[PDB]
Amino acid sequence: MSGIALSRLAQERKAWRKDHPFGFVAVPTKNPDGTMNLMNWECAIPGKKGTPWEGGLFKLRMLFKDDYPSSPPKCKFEPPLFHPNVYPSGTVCLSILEEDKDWRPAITIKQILLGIQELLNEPNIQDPAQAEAYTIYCQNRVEYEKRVRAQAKKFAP
Amino acid sequence: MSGIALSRLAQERKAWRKDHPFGFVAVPTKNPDGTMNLMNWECAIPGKKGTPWEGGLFKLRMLFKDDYPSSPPKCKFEPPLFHPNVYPSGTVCLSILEEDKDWRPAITIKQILLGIQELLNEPNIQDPAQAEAYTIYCQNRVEYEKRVRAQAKKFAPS
Amino acid sequence: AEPVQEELSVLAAIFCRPHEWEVLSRSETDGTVFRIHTKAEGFMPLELVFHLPVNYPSCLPGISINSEQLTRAQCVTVKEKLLEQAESLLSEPMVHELVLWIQENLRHA
Numbered sequence A: 001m002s003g004i005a006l007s008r009l010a011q012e013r014k015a016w017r018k019d020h021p022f023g024f025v026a027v028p029t030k031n032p033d034g035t036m037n038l039m040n041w042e043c044a045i046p047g048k049k050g051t052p053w054e055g056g057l058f059k060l061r062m063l064f065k066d067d068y069p070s071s072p073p074k075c076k077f078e079p080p081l082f083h084p085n086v087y088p089s090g091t092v093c094l095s096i097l098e099e100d101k102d103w104r105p106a107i108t109i110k111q112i113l114l115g116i117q118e119l120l121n122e123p124n125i126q127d128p129a130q131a132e133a134y135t136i137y138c139q140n141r142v143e144y145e146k147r148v149r150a151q152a153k154k155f156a157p
Numbered sequence B: 001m002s003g004i005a006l007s008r009l010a011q012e013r014k015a016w017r018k019d020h021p022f023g024f025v026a027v028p029t030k031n032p033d034g035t036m037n038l039m040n041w042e043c044a045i046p047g048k049k050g051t052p053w054e055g056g057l058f059k060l061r062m063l064f065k066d067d068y069p070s071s072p073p074k075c076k077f078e079p080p081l082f083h084p085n086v087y088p089s090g091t092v093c094l095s096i097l098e099e100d101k102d103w104r105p106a107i108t109i110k111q112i113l114l115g116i117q118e119l120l121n122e123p124n125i126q127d128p129a130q131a132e133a134y135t136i137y138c139q140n141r142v143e144y145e146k147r148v149r150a151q152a153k154k155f156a157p158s
Numbered sequence C: 001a002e003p004v005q006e007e008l009s010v011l012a013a014i015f016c017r018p019h020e021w022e023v024l025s026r027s028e029t030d031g032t033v034f035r036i037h038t039k040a041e042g043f044m045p046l047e048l049v050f051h052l053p054v055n056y057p058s059c060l061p062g063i064s065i066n067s068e069q070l071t072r073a074q075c076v077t078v079k080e081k082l083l084e085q086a087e088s089l090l091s092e093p094m095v096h097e098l099v100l101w102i103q104e105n106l107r108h109a
Helices: A002-018 A109-121 A131-139 A141-154 B003-018 B109-121 B131-139 B141-154 C002-014 C073-082 C084-088 C095-101
Strands: A025-030 A036-046 A057-063 A074-077 B025-030 B036-046 B057-063 B074-077 C021-025 C032-036 C047-052
Touching: A002 A025, A002 A036, A002 A109, A002 C002, A002 C095, A025 A109, A036 A109, A036 C002, A057 A109, A131 A141, A131 B003, B003 B025, B003 B036, B003 B109, B025 B109, B036 B109, B057 B109, B131 B141, C002 C021, C002 C032, C002 C095, C047 C095, C073 C084, C084 C095
Parallel strands: none
Antiparallel strands: A025 A036, A036 A057, A057 A074, B025 B036, B036 B057, B057 B074, C021 C032, C032 C047
């Protein structure tokens, strides 16, 4: 069942290179032998501007199962981020990234990355994944945005 | 916006959706905005069978303070019920629903609803919350259960 | 060239057979020659040998079809026509597209 997947990831790639949103990165990693790993991607998401996430470029890895595209990718921030919906392991907690929920095989890698970027400044109250970020986000948002700006500055080239 | 509260409540929600007792309902209410209010829940408890309280589905609202889960939730029957341990406002008088008593932060919404359901056919003599229901329950239980069955039939769903 | 070598890598990945894919030759001049067998038929078995000169994809690739479950007379039609949307997908890595274009297709429909 890897054929439909490797092909699909391959439809994702050239469409991405031909046209993709500005400041976004999505690149399949490369094997030591000299082949291409389509099941594993190194991606980057830019912070929206007018926000505390601004000037920031935040790196995440995308992993695809063999039954892709009927299963969603596993999206993990490396390094892990300070966000209410991001686990200490860097895993992203999103509704469209889980199969029994709002995942569709029609969902593009672009749509995923955009949804996560949207999630950056719009945390979901119903998906606590990180204790510190969630609690501070609710309690004192000024201080929360303080942390976000420091983190954004840390990942600005 | 209480972080500790909303976090715990969101996991209570997902745990309830994954597994919960049959005939029980626990759904967060909807805000005027159209968002989800985790601090306010609309719940329903079915009567256990082997008892006078059945065929009845009794609706109760669960309300959480900002210091939840350090305080127990306030469980209030709407509409108010005829029970020795239920206040005229429909508030439930239970030991696990009291901070200075047997409330623990580890207690789940599921456990609470089950405990209240237990309280329905097993009133506590040491906790009078409604005077008439209590007195009738102690002295003339025949009329008490008559009223209970009439109420149970009255609150039977469609 | 970056687009080309990325295409080569992707093709080498898409196929994880045993005898799928091979690079027949590499050179600064004349470019790269490789072979793929991709399998297709269900009713009424393909070897495709692509040559990528150093001008591809701006230029046309050299192709060749062997498929002795099929006759040979078609291979001239099929090479002189896998050539078409090769001209449509011109200026960009087209190999993957052609490959998956023809297990859809045996000059069908």
